[PDB]
A = this chain, B = another copy of it.
């Protein structure tokens, strides 16, 4: 038969309309698209560099979680894609203000480039309660 996919959407977080969904929920599992440090009000990356962008990516992720009836506690795995491996600690310090206990599994590493010239992209898997 068909598959019961859900597509929770919020205009408070970015999307590439017609290319990807902010998130897809199937039964208990929520796949969240890679989040960038974009401000939906401006359509541009926030200023201030990797720390500001990482914070805004996680703010964006939180709006998507909330649209599905979830919160940061629901995240079970993230991948932190960095423009510069040197930013590991500074990004971790931002990250821990969102995931402060019961931490997701994680991988973090430096890639060549991200969409929109971003300095960080964060994807996630969450599970519904």
Contact = CB atoms under 8 A, between A and B. Distances in A.
A58 to B, nearest CB: 14
A85 B107 contact: no
A87 to B, nearest CB: 11
Chain A, interface residues (CB within 8 Å), range: 35 or more
Copies per complex of this chain: 3
Contacts of A110: 111-114
A123 interface: yes
Given A85-B113, A85-B115, A105-B33, A77 B129 contact: no
A18 interface: yes
Interface in A10-35: 16, 18-24, 26-29, 31-34
22 contacts: A3-B127, A4-B129, A5-B76, A19-B92, A19-B106, A20-B104, A21-B102, A24-B77, A27-B28, A31-B104, A31-B125, A34-B106, A34-B108, A79-B123, A81-B107, A85-B112, A85-B114, A85-B115, A105-B123, A108-B115, A110-B111, A112-B112
